[PDB]
């Protein structure tokens, strides 16, 4: 479920 391609930077 957690997407590896999601934003990996500070929100």
């Amino acid at each position, epitope marked *: 479920n*957690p997407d*590896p*391609n*999601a*934003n*990996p*930077n*500070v929100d």
Partner: antibody
Amino acid sequence: QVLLVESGGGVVQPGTSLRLSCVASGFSFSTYGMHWVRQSPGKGLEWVAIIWYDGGNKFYADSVQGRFTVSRDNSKNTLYLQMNSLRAEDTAVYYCAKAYRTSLDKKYGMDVWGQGTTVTVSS
Amino acid sequence: DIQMTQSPSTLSASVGDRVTITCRASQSIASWLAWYQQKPGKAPKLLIYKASSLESGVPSRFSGSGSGTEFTLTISSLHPDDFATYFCQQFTSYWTFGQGTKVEIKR
């Protein structure tokens, strides 16, 4: 401006351990996700791992799960790859790469790569 | 996973030629595709991001297009600095790469 420098590569026998390091300068390393990618002559480019800006989420390629551990020390601006149980197929040039800048996108690639450090596994 | 099929494997072209490299994703990847240039002994350099956006400092003769499964990188007028290997990369489901296209000098 933006600079990544990989280090720690060398010639090692199979089964041993080896830790690679990537030192970042010229940007706010602590706020960016980071990647390892490797390239071998008979397998092209292959993504290895990603670590979130804060060190929480880490994902790994199926081939290295259990054997490789990615980590970072934001206080030192350094990315780490701990390689264990090294196999001949781990012979490659290893690159570190910065995640792409934040935007409205929901998917993220890479924007800047380091020079690479060569790992050769042989008896 | 998602496989990227890049073609041709090698291409010999004269300076000033029109050069097009294609990549095909095994399933739809929307526009989540990047193009890289690599010269021997150096790291890949990002040229095009999100299928069609030129990166900083990349000359105007480069362009990229595509959405879904078929993508292309075109160099309208091949420059002496452009002979190199090019790679695509999808970034919608992990990160996977094409096999590479070597663009070689015709003589």
